[PDB]
Amino acid sequence: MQLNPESADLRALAKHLYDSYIKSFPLTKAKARAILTGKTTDKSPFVIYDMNSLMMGEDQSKEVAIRIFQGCQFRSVEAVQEITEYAKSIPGFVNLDLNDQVTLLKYGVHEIIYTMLASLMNKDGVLISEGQGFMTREFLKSLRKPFGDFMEPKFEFAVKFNALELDDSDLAIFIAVIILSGDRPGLLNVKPIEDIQDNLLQALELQLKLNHPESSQLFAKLLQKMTDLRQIVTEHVQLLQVIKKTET
């Protein structure tokens, strides 16, 4: 490996997605990790760990399980928006056939939501309300069916993913690689998507080699994850309609 014109341009592309990413998602993995790990001057989050801590926490539906799912829904809408905003700053993306831009984000946002959640998760739970709150894994599990199980696959994915210790520089280009997946169903101009993805995949490999001396095949194992995330989002999509069929 040599530091040359092509390598320096993969570094500028990495830096440009990193800044663009720090823009679109205010709550970065770095400040998320300072909050989870207590290493912040910032305000300390309020822990929701039982039904009583949730009441004070709130401080319409009657049902606390439904009400939490609703909150989960709204953040998702905001997340889909932030991911689209990010996508506009990926060199090539705004130039693609508008319909193709839509299929990419359509079929990608759920995989990107699983990834961004890991950033907000440790073994105890997930940061909520821009770091102002923390909801414990086991309490979310404590909600009646079918809500009790909704987030558990998120925690499963997030436990093994976070073990890779990816930072914001890696994640920005991880997310850009996902969005430009040339296999999303009904894509009018594939060859052009795959051209942006090839450039993004070189930018990813160089990143991980420079940033992760102890993980020799981390690039290979980020691709396995991008595979993992296909069946995960299926399972999420298919239970997410169960709730549309059984909850008014």
């Binding site: 809408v77 889909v80 928006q81 689209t84 905003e85 506009k88 508008l98 831009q101 839509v102 984000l105 359509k106 946002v109």
Partner: peptide, 12 residues
């Protein structure tokens, strides 16, 4: 449908 809506609006 609910998704494409929000994505086209964000692209705007």
């Amino acid at each position: 449908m609910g998704l494409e809506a929000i994505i086209r609006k964000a692209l705007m």
